[PDB]
Amino acid sequence: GQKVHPNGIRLGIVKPWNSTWFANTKEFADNLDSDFKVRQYLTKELAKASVSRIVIERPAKSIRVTIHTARPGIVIGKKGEDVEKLRKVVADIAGVPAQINIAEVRKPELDAKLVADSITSQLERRVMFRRAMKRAVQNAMRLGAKGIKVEVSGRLGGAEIARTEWYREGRVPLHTLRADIDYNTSEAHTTYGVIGVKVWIFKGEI
Amino acid sequence: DADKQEYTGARNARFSIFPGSGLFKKPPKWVMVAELVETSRLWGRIAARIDPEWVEPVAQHLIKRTYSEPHWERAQGAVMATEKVTVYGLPIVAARKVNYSQIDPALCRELFIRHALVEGDWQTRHAFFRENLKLRAEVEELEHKSRRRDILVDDETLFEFYDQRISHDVISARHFDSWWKKVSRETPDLLNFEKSMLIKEGAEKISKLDYPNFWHQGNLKLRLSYQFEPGADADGVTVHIPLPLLNQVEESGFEWQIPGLRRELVIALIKSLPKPVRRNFVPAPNYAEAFLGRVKPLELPLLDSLERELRRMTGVTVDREDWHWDQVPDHLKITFRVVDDKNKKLKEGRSLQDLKDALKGKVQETLSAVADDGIEQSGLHIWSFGQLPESYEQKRGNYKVKAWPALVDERDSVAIKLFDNPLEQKQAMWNGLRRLLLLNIP
């Protein structure tokens, strides 16, 4: 492993940060601790809702989180029911009252993290990896993407020895910083170990 | 429960209809039962559908009322809240909009007395309300003249001013109407505000000659309005212009402004100069004073005046293009709005040509509306006009309306149309005269 994280090289230029707030030397550490603590709860609770992305900002002893998800109905609940259950629990974890914004992700299979966690699901559902992967990669081209890289790695399909497999069609310029890349990883906890899953997505020049 | 065959009863308990009922298969949204029995689960034996407008009147000792979202609504002049009525924790009315101001008298007195009297955004007929609104107006144009917002006393003092003589019976708008009904007969002038708005600031010196309300340009007189809102599109001293006066107005000498701004005006103009020229003039307020102590308005154009007296002071030849007007603030630029007889501001700018390059068709039809006799004729082929007018004149209201008639060539005939410029009149009448001569020579 020698490449650099594309989102981590592209934070200050193109891709915005996931948390946006300020602190001194005192409150910064346990602020990060609470930011961690709410995130895994939201992910395990709404893992069936196809959560893509989480934004934290902290308005003056308050918190507003915005979660980008692809499916409206499950995360909103019927007749506005579940988001108020999510309301009080994150305030309980924070110690301050909170606000939750549900952000729709249209064009769902162009998001990297949703593609990654989707293709994680079928490997743990033991359908065969080649068909799963080429189905996951041609779909972005069909709905009009202009870069896609996909990888899985490690004890692949019950193999005794690990291997890596990558597909890529289009144009995925990692070394161009102005290129905009959607990137987040995933892990499949299959019966033989951990499949690693990586997805790079390329949208535009600026 | 929605799409569920279970019922929320008293406290957090849940039950279901005893299956021997006929409405066991036809569940109501609101049920009453006779016997609660715990056998496999909780069962109400004899069940019947009810309408939930029933249970508030018959459980007055049991209803708990929760009022949320207390917001002051203007239209009633009163605070609304959403009430929820419950017994044993059962939400009988999920939401009902009700008058929080009629519910409690403590805070709503302060809220109403502040809102409809101190801010005073009230749709009503009250005479003291009218006069206090006009007093706050005549103070806010004073602040707009001053460009300093310390003249007016704070609104909390106005709240105290109201509160000390509004009796304690007033809690809402209806009580206030009832109170003004019995108090307006004894003291009408008590609620009208006294003249103590300006106290000790020193701005309240404001000179009327330094801040005029009308500008005289030649024979004409143009309206002035004042506004303090820095960075706004309508900010700055705004001249209001009747539309037919456009043919007599010219931009010359107009940037002289009211005399109350000229010091910081010439400071802005002199610091619009680049750094080498700007270094000659230190300090800028002192040199502004030395300029204003010798300059008189309207004797020269503005740029020429700054150039020649600044040359007199230090000997630099500041060129015309050295002065930058984008660096000059917009509120110092005198806003232009063309208005009608009913003060509808049609078009606007901060230079006169922004008006003129957009109003020529509208000024033309304005001339045509007043010219109701047919000097303007078409299909004309032989000179049969007698003495063609040099400068056509009419009168509307208090102002004369001037234009210039001329011939117009049409390639098939000659026509007469109006023009708002003597030069365009000249070339138009020239071309029409040429076509007329060509038609008349054999």
């Binding site: 707030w21 507003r64 | 704070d154």
Partner: protein, 98 residues
């Protein structure tokens, strides 16, 4: 007479944050000093990136604290009511000193 310190992690965000404050302050009472660009603090961070070995392989990170100062000198006691209502975004911290 009032010192408004703005501390943020993005210059692209703190410019409009101080611009909103300055135009709202001059909107209702004027005589505001310009937003002073005051020397930012750079926190440089050296991290060993491999889990077990190769000390000489590291990454470098930094925190930039964009620091602006706004000064108002004259008594402007009516602006302060709407000044607390400007509900700026979470990206910048504001400190008001008298």
């Amino acid at each position: 007479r009032i010192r408004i310190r703005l501390k943020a992690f993005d210059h692209r965000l703190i410019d409009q944050a101080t611009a909103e404050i300055v135009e709202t302050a001059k909107r209702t009472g004027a005589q505001v000093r310009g937003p002073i660009p005051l020397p930012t603090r750079k926190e440089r961070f050296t991290v060993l990136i491999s889990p077990h070995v190769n000390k000489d392989a590291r990454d470098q990170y930094e925190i930039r604290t964009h620091l602006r100062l706004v000064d108002i000198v004259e008594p402007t006691e009516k602006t302060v009511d709407a000044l607390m209502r400007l509900d700026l975004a979470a990206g910048v911290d504001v400190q008001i000193s008298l």
